Design an enzyme around this catalytic site. Structure first.
Site, PDB file in Angstrom:
ATOM      1  N   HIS A 158       0.821  -1.207   0.000  1.00  0.00           N
ATOM      2  CA  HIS A 158       0.000   0.000   0.000  1.00  0.00           C
ATOM      3  C   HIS A 158       0.855   1.258   0.000  1.00  0.00           C
ATOM      4  O   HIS A 158       1.813   1.369   0.768  1.00  0.00           O
ATOM      5  CB  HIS A 158      -0.935   0.025   1.212  1.00  0.00           C
ATOM      6  CG  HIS A 158      -2.076  -0.938   1.119  1.00  0.00           C
ATOM      7  ND1 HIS A 158      -3.219  -0.669   0.398  1.00  0.00           N
ATOM      8  CD2 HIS A 158      -2.257  -2.163   1.667  1.00  0.00           C
ATOM      9  CE1 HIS A 158      -4.055  -1.687   0.505  1.00  0.00           C
ATOM     10  NE2 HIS A 158      -3.495  -2.607   1.269  1.00  0.00           N
ATOM     11  N   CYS A 183      -1.678  -1.109  -3.820  1.00  0.00           N
ATOM     12  CA  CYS A 183      -2.963  -1.736  -3.526  1.00  0.00           C
ATOM     13  C   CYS A 183      -4.034  -0.734  -3.097  1.00  0.00           C
ATOM     14  O   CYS A 183      -5.191  -1.101  -2.898  1.00  0.00           O
ATOM     15  CB  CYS A 183      -2.780  -2.810  -2.459  1.00  0.00           C
ATOM     16  SG  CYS A 183      -1.805  -4.209  -3.046  1.00  0.00           S
ATOM     17  N   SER A 196       8.081   0.578 -13.364  1.00  0.00           N
ATOM     18  CA  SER A 196       6.722   0.996 -13.671  1.00  0.00           C
ATOM     19  C   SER A 196       5.922   1.125 -12.382  1.00  0.00           C
ATOM     20  O   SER A 196       6.238   0.479 -11.382  1.00  0.00           O
ATOM     21  CB  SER A 196       6.044   0.013 -14.629  1.00  0.00           C
ATOM     22  OG  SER A 196       5.751  -1.214 -13.985  1.00  0.00           O
ATOM     23  N   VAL A 197       4.904   1.981 -12.400  1.00  0.00           N
ATOM     24  CA  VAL A 197       4.044   2.180 -11.237  1.00  0.00           C
ATOM     25  C   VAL A 197       2.577   2.155 -11.651  1.00  0.00           C
ATOM     26  O   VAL A 197       2.192   2.797 -12.630  1.00  0.00           O
ATOM     27  CB  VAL A 197       4.341   3.515 -10.520  1.00  0.00           C
ATOM     28  CG1 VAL A 197       3.489   3.644  -9.263  1.00  0.00           C
ATOM     29  CG2 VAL A 197       5.815   3.626 -10.174  1.00  0.00           C
TER      30      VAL A 197
END
Length: 210
Positions: free
Chosen positions: A93, A142, A171-172
């Site tokens: 998270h 998440c 990457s995000v």
């Protein structure tokens, strides 16, 4: 949307919950010969999202739970099949914390995360007697976070990783979870609700080498 409000439970990996992986029935195609999926906190959404990623490529994926002390456990897959250049996926998270611009993933700043992963890279390959290094790292958040804070962490992370001896593309993105009673894949808003977004956003950072 400022990610999870909870505190990241990223300590004592041996006490974490484990989720069963089920092979995806429409897995698809992937570039990579294999991948390590790293679950970075003891969270039900993260645990399931990690298992879902492994399900897409059940024969070539390894799921690892990794705590703040550097301790880990392989909860799915066969690390001995990992060889050469592979993908990493980091699952946790994202959280914005009060007194700073920045965001943190599973409790870590980008620099702290890079230090721990560089350490994990060394320890994991030696312990598992394999020779592998990530060619690409996918950050899989998440909780819903804005595009800009996603981009901000990504830039910090890709530079921090390089400063720790690991030059990798990064990457995000934000993960969706299939909500059985609703029959839809939805994003967790970090607090208490599922969010249906028509459009998914993903940022890809790569080294030019020019």
């Amino acid at each position: 949307w400022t990610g999870a409000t909870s505190k990241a439970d990223n300590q004592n990996v041996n006490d974490w919950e484990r989720v069963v992986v089920t092979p995806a029935v429409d897995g698809g195609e992937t570039r990579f010969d294999g991948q390590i999926i790293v679950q970075m906190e003891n969270d039900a959404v993260a645990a399931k999202a990690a298992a879902n990623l492994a399900g897409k490529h059940p024969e070539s994926s390894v799921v690892v739970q990794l705590d703040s002390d550097g301790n880990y456990r392989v909860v799915y897959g066969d690390p001995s099949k990992l060889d050469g250049k592979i993908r990493w996926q980091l699952v946790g998270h994202g959280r914005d914390h009060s007194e700073s611009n920045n965001t943190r993933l599973s409790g870590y700043s980008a620099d702290e995360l890079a230090v721990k992963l560089a350490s994990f890279q060394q320890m994991f390959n030696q312990a598992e007697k394999i020779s592998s290094k990530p060619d690409h790292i996918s950050i899989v958040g998440c909780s819903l976070v804005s595009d800009d804070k996603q981009k901000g962490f990504g830039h910090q992370f890709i530079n921090a990783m390089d400063a720790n001896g690991l030059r990798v593309d990064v990457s995000v993105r934000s993960a969706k979870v299939y909500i059985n009673e609703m029959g839809r894949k939805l994003y967790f808003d970090g607090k208490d609700s599922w969010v249906n977004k028509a459009i998914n956003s993903k940022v890809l950072l790569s080294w030019n080498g020019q």
